[PDB]
Design a protein around this ligand. Structure first.
Ligand code: COA
Ligand code: COA
Lengths: 366, 374
């Protein structure tokens, strides 16, 4: 028999065996964590793959419960009558390859019984697509109706569409470019440098030592969070106001500073530094044109119907990038402009508008 | 009492004594380092104050040498017939209060004989103006024809205009806003956090230990440098290209990564981390409206003729902030746009465009000084 799907909402661990990675390294004994919502159709033809971003996991939707400290990262997107209507669709999400919430990553044990750490291979977005395709195949699923994702999830979705157009009926590519830009690599590589600068990094082999480079990751996340915001919205929310009763003139904090310190600590309580490094390097690797004659050739090659969404105020994946995708993907009918003040984080915060784009995508999937 | 100006181009150390700071802390025995180009007129009416930005110093113009690692940060701006025409003007630049290039800052010795370090007071942009005014007063200078500056130097210029309008004829305020924004405080406070996270910070008292938080300041500087760039120009320049023959798919560097590493190292060879912290916190403190009924009231009642410059691609001080300054300052005729792909760093790179804004500011100041009697 195939590997059974987990019960609705529960985590299933799908063992896919060795994975030959794009750089030629063979990564042995890979496990991919899966969650799903909705029944799989008798014909197995109704799967909607939900692809999480840098710090997301398989927990797309649902409340904080046992195993899940917080609500789903796209809470409400999948369910009865929801944008992914689970009365008709089977929503499946993995924890990405390199992750820390059930899938093989740097904190996982290597063959030698020690955490991978510094021995974890450099993975690409294409390696993440291969791990997900292999997990689905083990569950008896060889094609999907659609792929949906924003940010790193949009890079995963775009590689899935360009690499395997015969095995996807439609896609949502939201708030990403065709390749990593210089600014993205610059902030990603410097975020990684902040983690590696922390003396508790221990060369990436901190797993199990009782010390971890959480301080360097909090620094990385504070800078990333600024890239995720709309500049004007951030100033309208916080301006130069002090935090509560503190006096910045005598060494107290500003409200925006306190908010960033809080965002850092929240990530430190739920996310592994080594995964942050591996997935940041996979984002820097992103390039749908590699080995295919460049981005224009690779996008023009892809005939799949695609909804391309970009956020007007996005500072990290500026809308010029989504205009490029919309112009070159022949299955794209035009750029869907998400006119939002909330920056790149609009892909998480604008649930109503992102849900509209998901409904359009699932119409194209038929 | 009156101290002489240094010889042209050379450093002068002006001792101004105690300075009462905005937060009420007294900073004893302050020294301000000064460089000048051009003669001081007998009537002392021809002074152009050049106000440096975060990592700048008093070396506005001229070559590397006589203790300067590199050419002036605005090399070419001052000279015969140049945008600051030293045949007519006396261009004076200080090293800012809190600096590490001759002025009193965290690396300087406190009265107890140990570096200020963690004991260095929190200073504001207004403290920086007050120190520079005191350095001028010690040199016998009470009136300035013009203040000119970009970035932190624009914050200094704008506070000078608003605080001392009767003692400035005109100003150039380039690539800054009326107050620090949430984004600027976010990146400045996080840069400071990257320095304080470095175990060699030693609470700020690393000076003279033989250890320094250069690694954390390099991280800070790499993030700052991205804020200073034009996004499109950075992608056209480097894209996702690898550095030389390195292979990023097996752990090598990208070109933009190598470039950022290089920029951080260059700062670590010339600049003090404690100074980076003190001056970044001074930028976060910028607010021309504080104690003045807010930014709109403060700028509306400032009568000084002002040229406001903003750079189209600036991601750190976006052009909406200079549109705001140009609308509110009654002496501003309209925003002067610097059409540049180089982001915030345009204030340093676009020498011809910035030079034209300086020359216009000083043609304005010369007309006004002819009609100013003191
Ligand atoms: C919550 C979210 C959906 C957007 O909201 P937000 O911008 O965080 O705004 P909120 O005001 O709700 O702030 C959330 C928290 O900030 C806290 N907060 C607000 N102002 C604060 C201040 N001045 N100081 C400290 N904490 C503050 C609130 O207490 C709240 O706490 P909680 O989340 O634990 O309940 C956020 O998760 C998001 O969109 N960004 C995350 C990006 C991400 O996860 N990336 C990884 C993959 S990209
Ligand atoms: C003045 C300034 C803005 C000029 O910028 P610019 O003329 O556009 O120059 P760039 O930003 O392209 O820098 C070129 C340098 O990068 C180096 N470089 C370029 N590509 C590189 C790469 N892939 N790897 C490594 N180094 C690289 C060059 O070798 C050159 O080095 P050099 O300056 O020692 O000769 C720049 O010197 C600078 O950023 N420093 C001033 C200080 C500052 O921005 N802030 C302080 C107060 S705001």
């Amino acid at each position: 028999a195939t590997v059974p799907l987990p019960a609705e909402g529960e985590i299933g661990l799908v063992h896919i065996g060795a994975l030959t990675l794009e750089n030629g390294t063979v990564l042995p004994d890979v496990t991919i964590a899966v969650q799903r919502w909705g029944e799989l159709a008798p014909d197995r033809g109704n799967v909607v793959m939900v692809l999480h971003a840098l710090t997301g996991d398989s927990h797309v939707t649902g409340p904080a419960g046992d195993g899940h400290p917080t609500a789903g990262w796209w809470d409400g997107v999948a369910g009865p009558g929801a944008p992914i209507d689970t009365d008709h669709w089977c929503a499946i999400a993995t924890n990405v390859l390199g992750g820390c919430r059930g899938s093989t990553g740097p904190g996982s044990l290597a063959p030698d019984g020690k955490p991978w750490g510094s021995r974890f291979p450099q993975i690409t977005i294409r390696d993440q697509v291969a791990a997900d395709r292999a997990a689905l195949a083990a569950l008896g699923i060889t094609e999907v109706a659609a792929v949906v994702g924003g940010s790193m999830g949009g890079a995963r979705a775009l590689e899935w569409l360009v690499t395997h157009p015969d095995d996807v009926r439609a896609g949502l590519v939201l708030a990403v470019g065709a390749r990593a830009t210089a600014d993205q690599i610059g902030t990603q590589s410097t975020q990684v440098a902040a983690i590696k600068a922390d003396p508790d990094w221990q060369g990436g082999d901190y797993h199990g030592t009782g010390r971890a480079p959480t301080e360097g990751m909090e620094i990385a996340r504070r800078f990333a969070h600024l890239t995720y915001r709309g500049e004007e919205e951030l100033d309208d929310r916080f301006a130069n106001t002090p935090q509560d009763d503190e006096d910045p003139l005598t060494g107290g904090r500003y409200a925006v500073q306190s908010y960033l310190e809080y965002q850092g600590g929240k990530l430190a309580r739920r996310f592994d530094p080594g995964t942050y490094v591996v997935l940041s390097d996979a984002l820097s690797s992103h390039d749908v044109g590699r080995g295919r004659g460049g981005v224009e050739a690779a996008l023009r090659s892809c005939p799949v119907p695609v909804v391309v969404g970009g956020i007007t105020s996005d500072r990290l994946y500026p809308i010029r990038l989504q205009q490029e995708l919309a112009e070159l993907l022949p299955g794209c009918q035009g750029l869907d402009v998400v006119d939002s003040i909330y920056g790149h984080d609009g892909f998480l915060v604008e649930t109503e508008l992102v849900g509209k784009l998901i409904r359009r995508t699932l119409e194209l999937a038929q």
